[PDB]
Amino acid sequence: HHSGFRKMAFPSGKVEGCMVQVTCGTTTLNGLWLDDTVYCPRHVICTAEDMLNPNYEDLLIRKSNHSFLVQAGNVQLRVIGHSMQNCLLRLKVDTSNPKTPKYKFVRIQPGQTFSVLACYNGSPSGVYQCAMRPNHTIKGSFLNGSCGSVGFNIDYDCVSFCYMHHMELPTGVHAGTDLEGKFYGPFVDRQTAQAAGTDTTITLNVLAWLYAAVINGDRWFLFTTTLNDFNLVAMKYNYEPLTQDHVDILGPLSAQTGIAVLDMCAALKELLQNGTILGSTILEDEFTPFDVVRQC
Amino acid sequence: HHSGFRKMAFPSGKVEGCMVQVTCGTTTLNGLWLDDTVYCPRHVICTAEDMLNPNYEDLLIRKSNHSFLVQAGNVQLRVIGHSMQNCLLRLKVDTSNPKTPKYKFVRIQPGQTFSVLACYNGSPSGVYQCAMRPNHTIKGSFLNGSCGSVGFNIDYDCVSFCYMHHMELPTGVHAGTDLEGKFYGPFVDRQTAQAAGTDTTITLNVLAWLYAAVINGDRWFLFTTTLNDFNLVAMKYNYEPLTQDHVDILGPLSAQTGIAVLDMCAALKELLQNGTILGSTILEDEFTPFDVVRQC
Ligand SMILES: *[C@H](O)[C@H](C[C@@H]1CCNC1=O)NC(=O)[C@H](CC(C)C)NC(=O)OCc1ccccc1
Ligand SMILES: *[C@H](O)[C@H](C[C@@H]1CCNC1=O)NC(=O)[C@H](CC(C)C)NC(=O)OCc1ccccc1
């Protein structure tokens, strides 16, 4: 039986109206236009050679308002102020964006998911769903020219911006900032080898997703266990330890299925100790309990 | 190494501006508002009992322009004409949609992909990527209230609408129409058991996707073969036979990788005859050669 449960992004239209192209010299990336401010990654001011070890304060002294070409489709927005805000530039412009949605800036926590609007040369290209990893990377789909693309959640009428894209690490995963310009994790916007912590599997999301498999009809993977025994297993297999807070979070899903959280933990325990579910021959950890519900 | 290759939907903003809510009696679903026309599934005129065996011509005689409540956010659009167009209603309205994009209607072929904007009560909820299956179903994510949600591709400024959602089959997969109201496949909009052909795997897309794995660094699955020998294998494993047209289609990918199409076919042959690649412990067949390229 085809469940239809799958990764789904939020509708992107509210964010598409906010994307501009920002060029400084021969570097081009994307900017986010909200009211009369355009935010973009500060390494737009870098040349090729600068990115290996940039002195951002120094590179910026050589720039002026007129150094930044901001393009919203056909129009050119006039820059009337520029300043560095952590790893972003804040470019003040003469025109407030009439398509500015209701919005807020949010610093998401590891394990939380969001939608990415991937953009190139200021033009949206595609949308997909991502998670903030325990080691503060995200496993995105980003190519050259994608910096300044943003991640977001929508709640009713309101866009909560949580991510702006800056860089790719040697393992192919991605690092970036919140919209206050502050990197997630220990990363810095320099093109030198940087290592992410080893990456833990998001237990809370695996559990929620194993619930979805049960809500969709699957159950071949269902013994019980205790919190401390499961956490002993989790430490062995690079899963995050479970807390009572997470148990409470899973409450609703546990009711609908009439399956005990700790019974699900015992199923997960066997799977880890032994070795398909909703298709994947592995355990999906980028669905939150929220996502599993919204989608049912 | 994390490739980042993944299913990506088109940005949905152009389509979001076209979605309305259509209610007739106690049945509510989604409509598509383009210029001064609203399209929706004709089973909006059905009650519960009607859907088991509907006489649509007869149910419609009992309706009038004022039977259809069309809601675009706050506004109510006045219906000034209604007619049946195959399995859709065409509802003429007094107001041309100012957010109508450049668009066309396209009947897609099996193997082609498109984005779905899933909607409920006229409000977009999420976006994801789907394929038209060889047996003319799609493996969607649709719940009650989702009918009238549409599938689409975007090429530059232009939306090509290819799907409107009508129904779920007993296996959990989905059936619907193009925007001229014509079902894909042999299905009809009646809630009785209907069987889809057995579903073939889309060889052309599997090959393209095995190319992506090579473009992303993977190669553990790479002997050669001939077209007729591979097609002998394909028939055994419920894969579509390969043609020279498909070989030509794969030309570009074959160049970039410097790997012969038929060499890839030999890799696929072993995998089928023997038994991970870009993550999946199985072979993804809902990426077209187009998608693999656009994303590189
Ligand atoms: C901004 O568009 C760009 C996005 C990178 C390029 C390829 N994939 C991405 O996610 N960011 C950078 O190029 C970044 C700039 C520094 C000042 C931080 N450097 C970087 O990501 O280096 C690693 C890398 C570059 C090119 C291909 C693969 C990895
Ligand atoms: C329209 O929103 C609705 C969408 C179905 C409901 C659940 N998942 C879907 O994709 N379409 C129908 O309810 C359809 C109407 C007939 C006149 C064709 N009937 C239908 O799909 O029956 C099968 C079914 C119903 C409910 C749950 C699962 C399967």
Residue numbers in the entry:
A (entry chain A), B (entry chain A): -1 to 220, 223 to 275, 280 to 300
Published text:
The SARS-CoV-2 genome encodes two polyproteins which are processed by a 3C-like protease (3CLpro) and a papain-like protease. These viral proteases are essential for viral replication, making them attractive targets for drug development (5–7). Therefore, we generated three deuterated variants of GC376 by replacing hydrogen with deuterium at the metabolic soft spots encompassed in the R-site (aromatic ring and benzylic carbon) and evaluated their activity in the enzyme- and the cell-based assays.
